[PDB]
Amino acid sequence: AQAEQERIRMLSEAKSQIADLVTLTASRVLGAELQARGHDALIAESLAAL
Amino acid sequence: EQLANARRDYEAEIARARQEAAKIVAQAQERAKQQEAEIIAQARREAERLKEEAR
Known part of the structure; x- marks a missing residue:
């Protein structure tokens, strides 16, 4: 039972690490896209609520 | 003699x-x-x- 619980914990930790790596990769891709296109296009979103 | 024999038998039984x-x-x-x-x-x-298999 302890081995099964450890396996479940390891699976959860692996899923968490995969999510963190995916978030880091998405952040890097978004940063590259912002550097290429330019953040100025987001300025129009300032009037959504303000 | 009877008393001595009885005592010896009881002692032997207890020890065994x-x-x-x-x-x-x-x-x-x-x-x-x-x-x-x-x-x-x-x-x-x-x-x-189990740990090796999980790894």
Whole structure:
């Protein structure tokens, strides 16, 4: 039972690490896209609520 | 003579019973300890195998 619980914990930790790596990769891709296109296009979103 | 024989027989019976009980108790304790040690070793081996499979 302890081995099964450890396996479940390891699976959860692996899923968490995969999510963190995916978030880091998405952040890097978004940063590259912002550097290429330019953040100025987001300025129009300032009037959504303000 | 009858009194002496009765006393000797009672003493011998008590000694034999005590020796048998002590020997049986010691054997049972040794067997239990060996079984517990073997169980601990088997549990450790199973845990190691499960950890390797999970890794």
